Design a protein around this nucleic acid. Sequence first.
DNA 1: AAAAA
DNA 2: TTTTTGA
DNA 3: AAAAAC
Length: 351
Amino acid sequence: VKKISQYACQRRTTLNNYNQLFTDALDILAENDELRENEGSCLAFMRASSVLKSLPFPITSMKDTEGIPCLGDKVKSIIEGIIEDGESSEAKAVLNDERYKSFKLFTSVFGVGLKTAEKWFRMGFRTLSKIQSDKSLRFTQMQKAGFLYYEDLVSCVNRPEAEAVSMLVKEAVVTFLPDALVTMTGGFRRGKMTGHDVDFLITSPEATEDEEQQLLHKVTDFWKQQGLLLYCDILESTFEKFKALDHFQKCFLILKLDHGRVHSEGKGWKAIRVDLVMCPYDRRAFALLGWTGSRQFERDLRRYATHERKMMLDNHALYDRTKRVFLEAESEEEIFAHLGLDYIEPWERNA
DNA sequence: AAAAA
DNA sequence: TTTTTGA
DNA sequence: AAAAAC
Ligand SMILES: Nc1ccn([C@H]2CC[C@@H](COP(=O)(O)OP(=O)(O)OP(=O)(O)O)O2)c(=O)n1
Ligand SMILES: [Mg+2]
Ligand SMILES: [Mg+2]
Ligand code: NA
């Protein structure tokens, strides 16, 4: 029998999850450990959830868990409890916990992460209305946008919306850089029907250093002139060819997506979170691999490179510590081949 | 929390 | 037992 | 001067 690897980068994980009863519970337990800053226990529940997502059959008895890695005693007790009556008492207790409920609610606001959510909870806040109306609190520009466009941003992006955004991004980019290669990355590249945002990788084989640097500024100025730019933060590249977010130039946006552009009213438009990444042409395969995800697939790719191959992988490069050389790649397939891994298709990276 | 060193 | 867990 | 954004 074929042995399931402990690494997500050695598993094929499509969106057809036969174990959602177990993985929904494990994702909740992981999220609680993330909040309680218990990184180790968090990661163990994330890995167990990931491996169950790869299974081609549903777990219906404890015998079905034999030989599956990342399922220790604690995880097997959770699976046993769900087999017993269809529910997880552990995940149910987390769903009813006040700290957990407040963290989920507060971090659902764009611009609010773990530190600000924890701060507001310890101050005694429990609702978004009481936070917004408070006269002592001061909000960042990101949080102001997060509250103003809250319902649109919490409703998530569907495929017709992602496709409409892709058309807008591609059309704007090729207007200013005709030879640019625009790729939608993230969940939508992995075949997802929904996402919290729409991510893109932009690269150009012939653009100069100045042209490459100016593209995101030209495209966002163009949208600003049209009143489509609801939020914009451009992070300049800190990329160093000879060697936390990656160092490529990027922008975190909120775009006004007119309903007439969506082929699938109210105010007639929807606020959409969009991320654009510009990378030098020679790093395009590393950037594409890093931005395609999933987060668990990326973690395990890097963990496999370190522990199994004595290599160092990131969104910009692959370094071989034994040969003392950087390994170049023109495609994701070439990165997988450098690592000694069978190629995993993007729609198989939903770890 | 699980697996490796 | 202690170390590692993605950059 | 942290925090947030992946
Ligand atoms: N902690 C993280 C977060 C993100 N990423 C990478 C892989 C995914 C990519 C996009 O980030 P998200 O937009 O948050 O990921 P997603 O897969 O697109 O999921 P969603 O469908 O919710 O946008 O960046 C990662 O490696 N590690
Ligand atoms: Mg995304
Ligand atoms: Mg993103
Ligand atoms: Na948030």
